[PDB]
Every structure is written in C-alpha cells, then in structure tokens.
Design an enzyme around this catalytic site. Structure first.
Site, mmCIF file in Angstrom:
data_model
loop_
_atom_site.group_PDB
_atom_site.id
_atom_site.type_symbol
_atom_site.label_atom_id
_atom_site.label_comp_id
_atom_site.label_asym_id
_atom_site.label_seq_id
_atom_site.Cartn_x
_atom_site.Cartn_y
_atom_site.Cartn_z
ATOM 1 N N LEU A 17 0.583 -1.475 -0.031
ATOM 2 C CA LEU A 17 0.169 -0.350 -0.024
ATOM 3 C C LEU A 17 1.148 1.244 -0.209
ATOM 4 O O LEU A 17 1.592 1.885 0.349
ATOM 5 C CB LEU A 17 -0.810 -0.024 1.219
ATOM 6 C CG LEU A 17 -1.753 -1.142 1.206
ATOM 7 C CD1 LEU A 17 -2.817 -1.032 2.536
ATOM 8 C CD2 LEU A 17 -2.678 -1.474 -0.031
ATOM 9 N N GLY A 18 0.992 4.342 -1.257
ATOM 10 C CA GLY A 18 2.811 4.414 -0.156
ATOM 11 C C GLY A 18 2.747 5.361 0.311
ATOM 12 O O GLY A 18 4.135 5.409 0.813
ATOM 13 N N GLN A 19 1.493 6.173 1.309
ATOM 14 C CA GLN A 19 2.124 7.756 1.559
ATOM 15 C C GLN A 19 2.625 7.563 3.581
ATOM 16 O O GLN A 19 2.577 8.512 3.951
ATOM 17 C CB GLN A 19 0.980 8.349 1.994
ATOM 18 C CG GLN A 19 0.087 8.284 1.700
ATOM 19 C CD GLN A 19 -1.548 9.315 1.676
ATOM 20 O OE1 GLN A 19 -1.126 9.788 0.540
ATOM 21 N NE2 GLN A 19 -2.518 9.047 1.720
ATOM 22 N N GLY A 21 4.266 4.711 4.345
ATOM 23 C CA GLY A 21 5.444 3.819 4.802
ATOM 24 C C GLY A 21 5.603 2.398 4.387
ATOM 25 O O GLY A 21 5.902 2.464 3.265
ATOM 26 N N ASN A 89 -8.619 5.745 2.555
ATOM 27 C CA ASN A 89 -8.816 6.447 3.473
ATOM 28 C C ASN A 89 -10.271 7.519 2.953
ATOM 29 O O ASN A 89 -10.248 7.675 1.562
ATOM 30 C CB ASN A 89 -7.305 7.928 3.234
ATOM 31 C CG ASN A 89 -7.077 8.152 1.863
ATOM 32 O OD1 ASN A 89 -7.501 9.347 2.040
ATOM 33 N ND2 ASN A 89 -6.888 7.502 1.129
ATOM 34 N N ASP A 130 -2.220 13.794 15.024
ATOM 35 C CA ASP A 130 -1.987 13.634 13.184
ATOM 36 C C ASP A 130 -3.543 13.566 12.790
ATOM 37 O O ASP A 130 -3.962 12.502 11.771
ATOM 38 C CB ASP A 130 -1.174 12.715 12.677
ATOM 39 C CG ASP A 130 -0.825 13.336 11.177
ATOM 40 O OD1 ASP A 130 -1.457 14.476 11.185
ATOM 41 O OD2 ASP A 130 -0.705 12.613 10.291
ATOM 42 N N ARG A 134 -6.785 11.869 5.544
ATOM 43 C CA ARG A 134 -6.041 11.090 4.943
ATOM 44 C C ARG A 134 -5.401 10.442 5.730
ATOM 45 O O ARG A 134 -5.548 8.663 5.742
ATOM 46 C CB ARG A 134 -4.949 11.457 4.361
ATOM 47 C CG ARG A 134 -3.763 12.359 6.208
ATOM 48 C CD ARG A 134 -2.704 13.141 5.602
ATOM 49 N NE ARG A 134 -1.857 13.424 6.893
ATOM 50 C CZ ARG A 134 -2.242 15.339 6.442
ATOM 51 N NH1 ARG A 134 -3.026 15.845 6.043
ATOM 52 N NH2 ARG A 134 -1.355 16.480 7.836
ATOM 53 N N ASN A 135 -6.003 9.613 7.249
ATOM 54 C CA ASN A 135 -5.756 9.139 7.975
ATOM 55 C C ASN A 135 -7.337 8.988 9.246
ATOM 56 O O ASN A 135 -6.942 7.644 10.047
ATOM 57 C CB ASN A 135 -4.974 9.724 9.690
ATOM 58 C CG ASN A 135 -3.602 10.059 9.090
ATOM 59 O OD1 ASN A 135 -2.727 9.764 8.312
ATOM 60 N ND2 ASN A 135 -3.364 11.492 9.862
ATOM 61 N N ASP A 148 -5.542 4.553 14.938
ATOM 62 C CA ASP A 148 -5.264 4.024 15.715
ATOM 63 C C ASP A 148 -3.066 4.335 15.924
ATOM 64 O O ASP A 148 -3.030 4.517 16.845
ATOM 65 C CB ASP A 148 -4.880 2.581 15.781
ATOM 66 C CG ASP A 148 -6.231 2.570 16.831
ATOM 67 O OD1 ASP A 148 -6.785 3.060 16.686
ATOM 68 O OD2 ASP A 148 -6.348 0.909 17.504
HETATM 69 C C1 LIG Z 1 -3.941 1.336 12.635
HETATM 70 C C2 LIG Z 1 -2.194 0.471 12.649
HETATM 71 S S1 LIG Z 1 -0.710 0.846 11.572
HETATM 72 O O1 LIG Z 1 -0.766 2.758 11.978
HETATM 73 O O2 LIG Z 1 0.292 0.467 13.108
HETATM 74 O O3 LIG Z 1 -0.744 0.643 10.935
HETATM 75 C C3 LIG Z 1 -1.413 1.137 9.350
HETATM 76 C C4 LIG Z 1 -0.661 2.510 9.174
HETATM 77 C C5 LIG Z 1 -1.781 3.353 8.051
HETATM 78 C C6 LIG Z 1 -3.029 2.992 7.700
HETATM 79 O O4 LIG Z 1 -3.322 3.443 6.616
HETATM 80 C C7 LIG Z 1 -4.113 4.678 7.196
HETATM 81 C C8 LIG Z 1 -3.457 0.785 7.684
HETATM 82 C C9 LIG Z 1 -4.189 0.430 7.758
HETATM 83 C C10 LIG Z 1 -4.933 -0.674 8.178
HETATM 84 N N1 LIG Z 1 -5.793 -0.716 7.913
HETATM 85 C C11 LIG Z 1 -5.898 -0.358 6.754
HETATM 86 N N2 LIG Z 1 -6.993 -0.703 5.644
HETATM 87 C C12 LIG Z 1 -6.954 0.537 4.312
HETATM 88 C C13 LIG Z 1 -6.012 0.732 4.083
HETATM 89 C C14 LIG Z 1 -5.469 1.498 2.799
HETATM 90 C C15 LIG Z 1 -6.023 0.404 2.007
HETATM 91 N N3 LIG Z 1 -6.099 1.259 0.453
HETATM 92 C C16 LIG Z 1 -5.672 1.658 0.470
HETATM 93 C C17 LIG Z 1 -5.475 2.845 0.884
HETATM 94 C C18 LIG Z 1 -5.105 4.345 0.653
HETATM 95 O O5 LIG Z 1 -6.413 5.366 0.363
HETATM 96 N N4 LIG Z 1 -3.760 4.996 0.897
HETATM 97 C C19 LIG Z 1 -3.549 5.986 -0.334
HETATM 98 C C20 LIG Z 1 -2.203 3.861 -0.070
HETATM 99 C C21 LIG Z 1 -5.165 2.576 2.442
HETATM 100 C C22 LIG Z 1 -5.000 0.855 5.202
HETATM 101 C C23 LIG Z 1 -4.793 0.178 6.735
HETATM 102 C C24 LIG Z 1 -2.398 0.455 9.262
#
Ligand SMILES: CCS(=O)(=O)Oc1ccc(OC)c(-c2c[nH]c3ncc(-c4cncc(C(=O)N(C)C)c4)cc23)c1
Length: 267
Positions: A17, A18-19, A21, A89, A130, A134-135, A148
């Site tokens: 998934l 790349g904004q 990390g 998001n 934050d 987007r989050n 979280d």
């Molecule tokens: C909170 C635990 S964590 O903070 O330790 O790990 C993280 C960190 C960041 C996350 O995304 C916000 C996640 C996450 C959890 N569950 C998720 N389901 C779906 C997606 C996702 C799928 N496809 C496209 C997109 C998108 O819109 N893009 C611009 C890529 C985002 C991301 C996640 C988990």
C-alpha cells in the site's frame, strides 16, 4: 502481549500500500481474511517506538478505531497486524464519491463516528497528534475508523511537548502547537475542526492558496476558513468552536459527539 503474539508464517503479503511507509495488504491464511500489516524495515522507525506502538494499540477497543488483530514481535522483521478497511482513506474516498450516495446525512454519520473515537481517546487519556482525513479509513456502508497510529499517553489535564526540530502539518495544527510545540486533546479538537471542513468540502485542501509561513500570523489575528458551500450553520459553528485560540474554550469531544449524534438522529 503473548496473547496477541503471532507467527509471521500466519500471514502472506499480497499487495503493497505508499504514503504511510511500510504497510502491506496481507492475508491471514487461517481465516482467509484480508488484513493490513505494518512492517519495520531499514530502521525507518526506531524499534522501541515501534514496539510501544504495538503495546498501546492492544489497549484500544472501539468500533471507530482500527482494530489490532495480532503482532509479530519476537524475531525481526517485526509485524503489526490490523483489520483491513475496504475503501481506503477518507480523503480520496470523499473526492471520488457519488455525492448523491454520500450525502448530507452520510457526512453527519461520518463525523459522529470520528468524534465517537476521539471521545473514547479523551476518556482513556490518549492523544492522536495527526487527526486528518488521510488518516481516517472507510469500510463498507460508510463506516469510518480513525487510525490507531501513533497514539501517545497523556492525562486529560496535561500537555505533551514535542521534540525539537519537529515539523507539523501546519494547516491541521493548532496555534499552541505551531508556536510552542505543545499538544493537548484540545489541540486534537482543533485538528478535528479542520477534518470537519475536509468532510464538508468533500476533500478540498485547507486554507487554499494561503502560504504556510503566514498561517499562524493569520490565526492570531482571528482569521478562520469560511463556511463551505452547502455546510449547515450548526456544523460551521462547531468548526468555529474547535478553532478558538484558547484551548480551554474549545469543546470536549464528548460535547462534540453528542452534538453530531443529535443532528444525526434528527435527520
Ligand atoms: C493502525 C495500525 S498501524 O498504524 O500500526 O499501521 C497502519 C498505518 C496506516 C494505515 O493506513 C491508514 C493502516 C491501515 C489499517 N487498515 C487499513 N486498511 C486499508 C488501508 C488502505 C488500503 N488501500 C488504500 C489505502 C489508501 O488510501 N492509500 C493512499 C494508500 C489505504 C490502510 C490500512 C495501518
């Protein structure tokens, strides 16, 4: 920790998934369940910080906060396993939606869910630091969950002082934070209002065209974003309430939540 502990072999990575990390779309083999996995690679994040993040999340339990499913924290590489949200998001969701489907009531519903999660975080002495669109993540049927992250422990009546050289998302960042790197649940309330604006504008960028260097200068002279077209005056007043200079005068998430819930019930 031993109850959450998992074998890395239980998970198969499927898509990257790349904004955010190092986050992958994985499959929890046993349950044939699509999951999201955060990996630690190239020391992008310090190990002890990564571990504490995982330890914190397992204390979190709320229908509008991304749920921890398990962790792999014995042998590197380290994993955090969370639930997968189908539609990505909230920022990109709102930008690309059918506004006839995602209408006023759905916008109300979305804010009620987010304020619910932050009311919870308020009661359990956490801060987000934050809060933005987007989050936030979107599931089926307009379900919204706050990421979280990235949560810090902090009693309601205290202040987190950020490290030196720290750079913030200026357009989402409260005045006390911009000027003295101080954070509070009330600074999260500020961010919520900016998020509240992103929702009503269906994903427009905040303070359009305004230079980041002159945002704080504008804020201390009582400039605030204008009410978006179509936004109910009741919603803008909450936005404005969240955007007050003195954080003490800003509403609590408990108060914000009841407001939107009432507005949602009454529609
Ligand atoms: C909170 C635990 S964590 O903070 O330790 O790990 C993280 C960190 C960041 C996350 O995304 C916000 C996640 C996450 C959890 N569950 C998720 N389901 C779906 C997606 C996702 C799928 N496809 C496209 C997109 C998108 O819109 N893009 C611009 C890529 C985002 C991301 C996640 C988990």
């Amino acid at each position: 920790y031993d109850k959450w502990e998992m074998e890395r072999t239980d998970i198969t990575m499927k898509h990257k998934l790349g904004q955010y990390g190092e986050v992958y779309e994985g499959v929890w083999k046993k349950y044939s369940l699509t999951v999201a996995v955060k990996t630690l690679k190239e020391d992008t994040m310090e190990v002890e910080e990564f571990l504490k993040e995982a330890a914190v999340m397992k204390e979190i339990k709320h229908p509008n906060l991304v749920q921890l499913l398990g962790v792999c924290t014995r042998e590197p590489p380290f994993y955090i396993i969370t639930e997968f949200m189908t539609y990505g998001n909230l920022l990109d969701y709102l930008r690309e939606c059918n506004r006839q489907e995602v209408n006023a009531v759905v916008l109300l519903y979305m804010a009620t869910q987010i304020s619910s999660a932050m009311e919870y975080l308020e009661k359990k002495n956490f801060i987000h630091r934050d809060l933005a669109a987007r989050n936030c993540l979107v599931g089926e049927n307009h379900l919204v969950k706050v990421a979280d992250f990235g949560l810090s422990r902090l009693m309601t009546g205290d202040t987190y002082t950020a490290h030196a050289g720290a750079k913030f998302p200026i357009k989402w960042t409260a005045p006390e934070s911009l000027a003295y790197n101080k954070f509070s649940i009330k600074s999260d309330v500020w961010a919520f209002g900016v998020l509240l604006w992103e929702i009503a504008t269906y994903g427009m960028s905040p303070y359009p065209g305004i230079d980041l260097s002159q945002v704080y200068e504008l804020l201390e002279k009582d400039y605030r974003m204008e009410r978006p077209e179509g936004c109910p005056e009741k919603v803008y007043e909450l936005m404005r309430a969240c955007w007050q200079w003195n954080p003490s005068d800003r509403p609590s998430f408990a108060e914000i939540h009841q407001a939107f819930e009432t507005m949602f019930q009454e529609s």
